[PDB]
Ligand binder design. Structure first.
Ligand SMILES: CC(C)(COP(=O)([O-])OP(=O)([O-])OC[C@H]1O[C@@H](n2cnc3c(N)ncnc32)[C@H](O)[C@@H]1OP(=O)([O-])[O-])[C@@H](O)C(=O)NCCC(=O)NCCSC(=O)C[C@@](C)(O)CC(=O)[O-]
Lengths: 376, 376
């Protein structure tokens, strides 16, 4: 696969769609999902959410030039805002010259929280739980046979205490669950509900919340990119001075939350449209991303930008990225299935890796434009 | 308008649409935009973002029972996830019994950032700017005579310094701009550009970034709700016990960022689909919401929950809410226009107020469920 797509931006939507279909070998049926409006049947839309009266369209695009660990990929994106697809594509083009994007990710581990109140001895109860870990882990894994046989399941438990709250001391257990190719909320909510009575028996507390955490900091995905000064040279500036201006923009986001919010918004301009294109939950991804940005107590940049010893501009993105290939709209929406076909992804973590590569490219594009814009 | 919609949940989408059209007095043409696929023509979609190959639908729904400052409203929502619309409607039904939602908002004030580097005397340069603030403000306002006629414009400037970054001292000016019914990005960006040469003259430094901040903490919208224990009573739980359980849930969110990220995600489940339905930029709203949530130096809850002197449950949501009635896809997308007609809003701050009421409702719905039978 060659994702360069020369001339794409100037082709008609039909000719774009034809080129995609040729490059990938999409069937006629696949192509007709995008050629004709209304690919989401109303009977399906009506079973997705409540009180449905119709459907709402956004444009569906493809970003070009992306390459992930040496493999070319085409990236579907659904969004209303201009410049995003272009910026991504152009930074992807530049990235290719130096090997594309390099990615990695954690195992697909999600937390389930079990909140326990009204214990007079929570610190002691925490050890009583930790001692009985294996028992709790076995109970968690009893019901979801499909998950286990696919090689997922509850791996471990950690327990936290919050002894100072206005509502008294709390204990909070986390089940740590490998959810394989799912986003995982239903899987872990189920397990949290299933172990709650047993934890209550061990601790003597009242269980309250039994619920996933969206701060999915054990489900991290990572991307890297490299850009050389020669690539960034403008009419106004040397490539070197552009790099320095990109580093200046980065330091500005790292110290000022007013800038960091905007900088990170730029990252999510790249990521959220992929999430939408694949039928995934963008509120989950957003909450994980921004909560992770302020894990230190200070709201900072999710990306890093540096100059290496060769003088090259090197960027990183590492962040929570809980996404699924199965479940909900990703299965039921015909175009979500088409997107996954276009992407070629075999695991949810592969989809996560593509996401962070696009977020990183979008951030770079935004910074480059802001740094190279002349003073009027 | 009566927003109650008896049996709406169980009508077909065609019947729900006909019913809305009758309540609102929508034209046959308006109803047609939802009764048929393809309300977003391809020529418009192709002009909205780059590399467009088609469109992508999500379901379009309406939440029922909402009442804001004593007026019933119907709330359009576009999203892929079940239970959101139902939960919002159900909590809105409860809220009606005690007066509905009560809302307010600030003026629609946005920050434009102007980053200045290369100054050995940033603290001095700050006072030189403030000494000449009236000129800077007059200059920003020459740039947009129409906004000023509409009753907006640059109101003030603030200046922040970061004298010790790893990239050297920086100074950052903020233009504080009343943007009326726009989200405002384009307006404030334009002003930042206009004042940049003047700030360079004053400070002797070099302007880098000129750009809005999405941390729109001078554009706050606020909602309140009240719920009695009688309303929350179940077969398994007294209403008083449910209220205690909700307060335990809130305290858990206030202390633990693992919980707060999820709690806040639930609020955004309510808000973002109204943002999408109105053609607004949901990445901006998200970034502002979650960055505001950590302004204290700890990532906490956007909502508050308390029990008043009567034993009643009272909740608040105050947050940044930068949305527009004009600008971008809000104008361009025929269904964004229709949403605004359904909502009946006459200013952007009115839309913002609706948004926080729906966010507050959604949070309440999640918590009520999590404190009683559980989410599953
Ligand atoms: C989903 C409900 C409301 C069902 O509720 P129910 O148990 O079926 O109660 P009901 O069936 O008697 O419904 C009563 C009212 O709910 C509304 N309603 C009820 N069903 C529908 C429907 N199909 N379509 C439209 N409206 C509906 C409707 O207004 C109805 O009034 P009535 O029928 O008496 O006039 C209930 O189970 C509930 O409130 N669940 C909330 C939990 C939830 O799933 N919230 C949604 C978002 S998930 C989320 O935010 C993530 C989370 C939870 O992790 C955030 C966090 O942790 O904080």
């Amino acid at each position: 696969l060659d994702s360069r797509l020369p001339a794409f931006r100037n082709l008609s939507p039909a000719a774009r769609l034809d080129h995609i279909g040729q490059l990938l070998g999409l069937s006629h049926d696949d192509v007709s999902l995008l050629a004709n409006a209304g690919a989401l049947p109303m009977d399906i839309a009506n079973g997705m959410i409540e009180n449905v009266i119709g459907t709402f369209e956004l444009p569906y695009a493809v970003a070009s030039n992306f390459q992930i660990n040496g493999r070319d990929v085409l990236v579907p994106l659904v969004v209303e805002e201009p410049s995003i697809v272009a910026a991504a594509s152009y930074m992807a083009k530049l990235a290719r010259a130096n090997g594309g994007f390099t990615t990695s990710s954690s195992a697909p581990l999600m937390h389930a929280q079990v909140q326990i109140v009204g214990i007079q001895d929570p610190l002691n109860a925490r050890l009583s739980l930790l001692r009985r870990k294996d028992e709790i882990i076995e109970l968690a894994n009893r019901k979801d046979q499909l998950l286990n046989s696919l090689g997922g399941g509850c791996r471990d438990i950690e327990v936290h205490t919050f002894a100072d709250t206005p509502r008294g001391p709390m204990l909070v257990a986390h089940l740590i669950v490998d959810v394989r190719d799912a986003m995982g909320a239903n899987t872990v909510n189920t397990m949290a509900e299933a172990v709650a009575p047993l934890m209550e028996a061990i601790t003597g507390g009242q269980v309250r919340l039994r619920i996933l955490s969206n701060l999915a900091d054990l489900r991290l995905a990572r991307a890297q990119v490299r850009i050389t000064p020669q690539q960034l040279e403008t009419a106004e500036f040397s490539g070197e001075a552009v790099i320095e201006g990109i580093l200046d923009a980065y330091a500005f986001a790292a110290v000022d939350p007013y800038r960091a919010a905007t900088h990170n918004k730029g990252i999510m301009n790249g990521i959220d449209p992929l999430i939408v294109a694949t039928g995934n939950d963008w509120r989950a991804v957003e909450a994980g991303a921004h909560a992770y940005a302020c894990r230190s107590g200070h709201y900072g940049s999710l990306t890093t930008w540096e100059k290496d010893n060769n003088g090259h501009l090197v960027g990183t993105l590492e962040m929570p990225m809980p996404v699924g290939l199965v479940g909900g709209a990703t299965k039921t929406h015909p175009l979500a299935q088409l997107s996954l076909r276009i992407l070629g992804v075999k695991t949810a973590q592969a989809l996560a890796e593509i996401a962070v590569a696009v977020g990183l490219a979008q951030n770079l594009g935004a910074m480059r434009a802001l740094a190279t814009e002349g003073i009027q």
